[PDB]
Design a protein around this nucleic acid. Structure first.
Lengths: 104, 103, 103, 101
DNA sequence: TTTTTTTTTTTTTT
DNA sequence: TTTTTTTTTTTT
């Protein structure tokens, strides 16, 4: 029994990168900036790695541009890769269980 | 705050919590949190409590406790001992967040 | 386009009621209490489950169960026996929602 | 112990209504439409405190807005002397509001 | 068309 | 009492 939910509203950092997998499913990557309040309650930007799959990846690939404001709802997944050694990347995964809404 | 940055987790604590205090009065509690889905899949989460909830967290949470956590994502950069850049994404729970012991 | 999300953690008011429609689909109703303290203050929520979650909720929830519910708000209009309009806002948990029995 | 959280993104139905309590505190009411495909759902959202001032100052008919609050079902006496209940989304110090666009 | 439960009293860009 | 165009049962 568990719950793994991420909700972000922010601005797309650069144009989305769409790839295709072995069966042809669209996979779209973006970076997303959210602004929090960093002792004078200042400003600070947090950058999020967001990966879409399926129809949302298609929709994100087509309508999201650099600077787009977007609502994103997904689940956290930490991916383990290795370089030359062990590395980790925490991403927000947006698939059938998630949601995306182009705002503006 | 111009964006929204919200994380909601329900899961099981991976080990007894580590609390620590500094010369600010602040309590800082660190835990790991397992969320699962069903093959059966498990995701491991690093969660850091600050302030009042840090005090509440250190006391009542124990290895295996079930807990609701609401916080915000924060990625910290650090140079490893090989000089190479690394990143740690944590869930930060403070005054704008929430914690609820379950069971 | 928009977003309509409700997240509740609370205690089930009574045993669920599960209704089966002529086509075999299930609808399960509960009430769910969430509280805040400062004196108590308990908010009662009407939660309706559809689909696979309706059968799961009907089978595993009982009076007093602690539960996580994720759904969407829906307000229904109806004329009362005095002839006047009334409204009932419910939390609808369907394929887009979630339910986790806690504790 | 429990959790009561509502997150909405939608469009304001009319210009906001703001009133002032005896202690000077602002209270702002809106209705907010969310849709899904196509059926539209209407929500009664009530802002308190600083967010109520911001809401009253910046929201207008048609504004797209993100809102985060708690559900509160309020009992009130109707125009005839019997009971009406209204479930509202209360947005206060524990909630959030963001103008979108 | 009532209930539950119980150890937590100032949210555009990478 | 009207706004706005594509989610069944764990312990690092």
């Amino acid at each position: 029994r568990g719950v793994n939910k991420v909700i972000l509203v922010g601005n797309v950092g650069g144009d989305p990168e769409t790839r295709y997998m072995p069966n042809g499913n669209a996979v779209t990557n973006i970076t997303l900036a959210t602004s929090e309040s960093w002792g004078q309650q200042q400003e600070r930007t947090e950058w999020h790695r967001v990966v879409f799959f399926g129809r949302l990846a298609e929709i994100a690939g087509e309508y999201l541009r650099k600077g787009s404001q977007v609502y994103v709802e997904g689940s956290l997944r930490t991916r383990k890769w290795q370089g030359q050694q062990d590395r980790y990347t925490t991403e927000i995964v947006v698939d059938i269980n998630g949601n995306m809404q182009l705002l503006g």
